[PDB]
Amino acid sequence: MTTRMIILNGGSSAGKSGIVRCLQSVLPEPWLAFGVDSLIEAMPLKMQSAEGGIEFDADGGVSIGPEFRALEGAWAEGVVAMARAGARIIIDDVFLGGAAAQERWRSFVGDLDVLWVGVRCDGAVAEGRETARGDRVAGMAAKQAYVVHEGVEYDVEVDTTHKESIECAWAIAAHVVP
Amino acid sequence: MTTRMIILNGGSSAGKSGIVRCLQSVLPEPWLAFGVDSLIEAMPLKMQSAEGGIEFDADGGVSIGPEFRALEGAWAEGVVAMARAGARIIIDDVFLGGAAAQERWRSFVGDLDVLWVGVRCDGAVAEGRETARGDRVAGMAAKQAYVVHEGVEYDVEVDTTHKESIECAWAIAAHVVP
Amino acid sequence: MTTRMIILNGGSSAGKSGIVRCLQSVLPEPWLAFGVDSLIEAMPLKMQSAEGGIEFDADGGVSIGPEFRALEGAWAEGVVAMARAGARIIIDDVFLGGAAAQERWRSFVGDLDVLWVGVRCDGAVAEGRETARGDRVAGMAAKQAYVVHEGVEYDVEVDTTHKESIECAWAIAAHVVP
Amino acid sequence: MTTRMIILNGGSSAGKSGIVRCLQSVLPEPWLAFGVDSLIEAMPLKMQSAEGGIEFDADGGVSIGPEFRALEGAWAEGVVAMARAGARIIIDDVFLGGAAAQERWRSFVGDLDVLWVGVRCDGAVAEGRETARGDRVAGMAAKQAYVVHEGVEYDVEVDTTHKESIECAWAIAAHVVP
């Protein structure tokens, strides 16, 4: 019953990061936050220049190779382990493989109580925010805005197009069983 | 006639930074962006621990001392100089002294063509965004949300409460004379 | 035999971070890097303002509470899990509890092949570097420079006082069994 | 007589940034620090993708175009203006044009009291540090390590190859006339 792991899925600039920081402030018990971005951070810089690594096409694309997935997996098993170890875990990801991505997670998650959250946002709005940000390579937002959700089943959906983060956070927190 | 300097004024988390990055992308000619934050950056770290420096009360407050103003001024004269040197300058500030702050600028600006922009945002919304951000000390948003505009005359106002940055940017760009 | 996890221990500004990035570039197989800093990052911002959390005394001190340790532990079990999952893991830590800290790790590590590395540096030199950095609160370097190693047994020691990071990296890489 | 502006010149990873932060802490009067990097920051992101802008060849190269120089100049006149306005200004640059770069500065500086500082460092050592850093594109260090100084006349030289930043700072501070 007790929610042991929250998994957020949404394209870039859909507002995931903000929701996470908000959820952390909201939720009474300490929740650790990890993600694909923090994984990239943990991975050697060359992984971004390697073959089976990950590359960011200048058009805003993103392609993941086996070398990257290999690591990505053991990492997943690791986060799950922290949860089973008793740590509350928040994870914002980007299901490039849509449904496929969610299955991958499911196999690692096992019978662990997980709250599946979908973070949507108008591609155009996202793209616009992508600019105001300056952080990412123009293109990713529009590219992931939809495909990522394609086929994924959530327990809670939030659209940051017209809802503030703190708000989306509140909607999510409301589904977290203590 | 030609707009030589854009000055943005708005409380923390009102969305200034984003607007700036957007304006830069929008406007055809290169615009250099500078601000109170980038000034803090240029100032020695101790300025934040000095007397006549600047201190961030844990309640989200902010107080500026003469040492800080002293520098702040020569800095202002400097940005103005870059403009007169022919560089298009964007400046997002936070008029803690409200009207007083705008006068200070006016004296440095001289007869230089300046577009005064006000960036407003619902204090609560801002405060909420302040959380999603994680960057600033909880409190500043709500504290500056209004006072800063008190008595300031703008050429263009934008409220990021329900308008995206790219949008506010567009509204602003529309007043920039080439 | 095969080295599955590298654990670095050294006071702040002793040069750990740099060594890590270097090791990652050097070592042929991809090594994931995690640490106390990245943990702080994953922890909710309030953990830094909470009771049993972690607080940075203005004199450069640092004290960890049970709430923090609680998380810290499950996190540890998690990193170990990633290793057993097959991911090569690098971990730069700061054994505030000296020997005590190493035992804590040992219990999580189990019979996992681990390379214990000590990163030393002249307190004064460190303190000086602490300034050039601007990142940390003046004081931590000098405070941890020695205590942290007190009682800890390593497999390899490196002193960044007169040795470059890339160099220390090389010395370390040389003890990593493939 | 009174030193009104300190200009540092050295290739990437030669240790400039650190020296600056150190000098700021050392020197009694507040010194504002600006640089080519902070300029890049102030320039629109597209300037990095524009023609007469600036581009970072993947081999670690760097080429500046007229559009970039155009801005770069007015910016220079601006920093000089801040100095004449009474602000003490520190500037760490990278004279890609070697001697040519110093002349450019000289014309803007005028008869302003300036302390010319050269920051040297063994190319290899720099390259190594470039790795430990993770910040820059592998290649720049080795490429600029020497050319930049070629033909430039300094008032003080410091080699961070075997000298800490705080140290180099001290050597520099010693030439600053109050």
Ligand SMILES: CC(=O)N[C@H](CO)[C@H](O)c1ccc([N+](=O)[O-])cc1
């Ligand atoms: C570091 C960065 O900019 N990452 C963004 C997402 O934040 C990129 O769209 C991305 C998407 C999916 C991904 N993945 O799932 O492997 C890796 C990067």
Ligand SMILES: CC(=O)N[C@H](CO)[C@H](O)c1ccc([N+](=O)[O-])cc1
């Ligand atoms: C660095 C930081 O967090 N600055 C925020 C604004 O961004 C703070 O509210 C602030 C407001 C006004 C100011 N000032 O005008 O001197 C300095 C800091």
Ligand SMILES: CC(=O)N[C@H](CO)[C@H](O)c1ccc([N+](=O)[O-])cc1
């Ligand atoms: C975030 C930061 O500045 N951390 C530095 C180390 O990098 C601090 O000395 C520290 C040391 C030990 C620690 N711990 O082990 O819990 C946490 C922070």
Ligand SMILES: CC(=O)N[C@H](CO)[C@H](O)c1ccc([N+](=O)[O-])cc1
């Ligand atoms: C942003 C960055 O990585 N800049 C480094 C220097 O720090 C690069 O070598 C560089 C050198 C000279 C330069 N310039 O002088 O125009 C611009 C960038």
